[PDB]
Amino acid sequence: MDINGGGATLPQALYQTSGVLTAGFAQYIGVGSGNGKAAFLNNDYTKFQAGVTNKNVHWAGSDSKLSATELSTYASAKQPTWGKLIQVPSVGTSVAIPFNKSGSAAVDLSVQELCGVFSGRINTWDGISGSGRTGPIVVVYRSESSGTTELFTRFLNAKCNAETGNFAVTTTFGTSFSGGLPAGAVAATGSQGVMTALAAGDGRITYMSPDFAAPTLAGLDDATKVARVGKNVATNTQGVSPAAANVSAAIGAVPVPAAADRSNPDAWVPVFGPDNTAGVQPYPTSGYPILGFTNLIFSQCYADATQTTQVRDFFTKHYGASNNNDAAITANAFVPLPTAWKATVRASFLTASNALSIGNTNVCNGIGRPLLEAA
Ligand SMILES: O=P([O-])([O-])O
Numbered sequence: 001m002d003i004n005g006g007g008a009t010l011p012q013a014l015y016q017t018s019g020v021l022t023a024g025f026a027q028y029i030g031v032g033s034g035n036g037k038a039a040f041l042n043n044d045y046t047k048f049q050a051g052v053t054n055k056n057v058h059w060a061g062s063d064s065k066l067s068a069t070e071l072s073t074y075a076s077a078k079q080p081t082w083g084k085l086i087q088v089p090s091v092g093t094s095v096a097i098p099f100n101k102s103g104s105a106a107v108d109l110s111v112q113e114l115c116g117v118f119s120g121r122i123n124t125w126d127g128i129s130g131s132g133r134t135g136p137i138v139v140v141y142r143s144e145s146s147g148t149t150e151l152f153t154r155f156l157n158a159k160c161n162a163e164t165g166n167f168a169v170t171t172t173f174g175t176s177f178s179g180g181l182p183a184g185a186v187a188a189t190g191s192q193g194v195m196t197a198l199a200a201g202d203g204r205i206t207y208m209s210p211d212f213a214a215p216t217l218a219g220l221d222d223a224t225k226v227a228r229v230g231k232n233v234a235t236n237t238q239g240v241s242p243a244a245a246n247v248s249a250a251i252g253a254v255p256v257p258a259a260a261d262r263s264n265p266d267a268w269v270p271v272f273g274p275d276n277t278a279g280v281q282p283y284p285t286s287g288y289p290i291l292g293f294t295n296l297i298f299s300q301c302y303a304d305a306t307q308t309t310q311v312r313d314f315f316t317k318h319y320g321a322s323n324n325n326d327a328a329i330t331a332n333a334f335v336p337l338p339t340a341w342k343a344t345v346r347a348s349f350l351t352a353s354n355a356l357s358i359g360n361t362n363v364c365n366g367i368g369r370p371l372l373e374a375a
Contacts, residue, residue, distance in 0.1 A: 003058035004026060005025065007030070007035065007061040008061040009146075009192070022314045024313075031146075033064040034049045040059055043078075045373070058307065059298045059299075062297055064145070087268055088269075088295060093292060093294055093335065095207050095208070098198060098225060098227075099204060108230075118160075120177075120185075136204070137182075139182050141188075142194060153167055153173065155272070158273050163179065165178035196272060211332045219262055247335060249286070271293075283366065301363070301364035302359070303370055324342075
């Protein structure tokens, strides 16, 4: 019998790569970050497989952080019997801007053009300078509670200061902008469902996992298909692509979680945000600007000893110095964590004497998420 994870679609092809998940892990089920969080927090397998109730949920992938309410509800309802949850970064990621509008000219968005496209202010292809293109822009967005949406709206919230309204940080893009969606915007479900929709009408644009924004990695560098971001015509500056190499320096510069705050799951997930605001990292000035982390949610404790070992063995691989998942991470258009980040994750969640460690024989004595499923 296996343990069950799922959630965020942004990293699902990574978790579905052979060998990334270790022994005892069922194949990852991509359903969106909101569904993944709900699956874990409520131990509700139907959020992974509709109509299927005879399994427990053991972990989730999410690119949406746990909210204050999610955390407090779990702490009061579940932690006394199941133990503390763990929320940790998995990999760093860009957010790509694929589009379906032919032409050999490179599409290179200034940040303010990106803002105007997603606010509806710029709604024709000839409103993007240097595009070579004409006709209407149709924005495709995620219908459901999405961590890609959260990562993207953090950027819009930080940068888009010149619209007729403001972008809120949210998991539901349809309500992010206080002035509404652009006329004609199209909703679709999942990373893959959005990419299918992008192709279902001409002149469409979206925001997307770099692992799905192009069929091949090198395709992230094709500016006839995946927009460059960061143009500044006044200074004669080209934007760059969402390839992992263009966000990896910025990911690597993100500070490890503050030592005295490590018992708070919120402290483990870095977020980017507005400039000169303590507690959030500013978006990078160099390289590709739209980035963040995708995360993993586990329990510290499982009533079953085999489940506990299985989970530890995954952390040993995914956060290991050797025999790790970094090659697969890169192959999936993502950024590995540096050594000091891996070491910090291991020190809290693997090293046995740490109060936070998975399966700690003192802290987890007699407790943990259940073996059997109960209705
Ligand atoms: O699916 P997502 O990753 O949540 O966007």
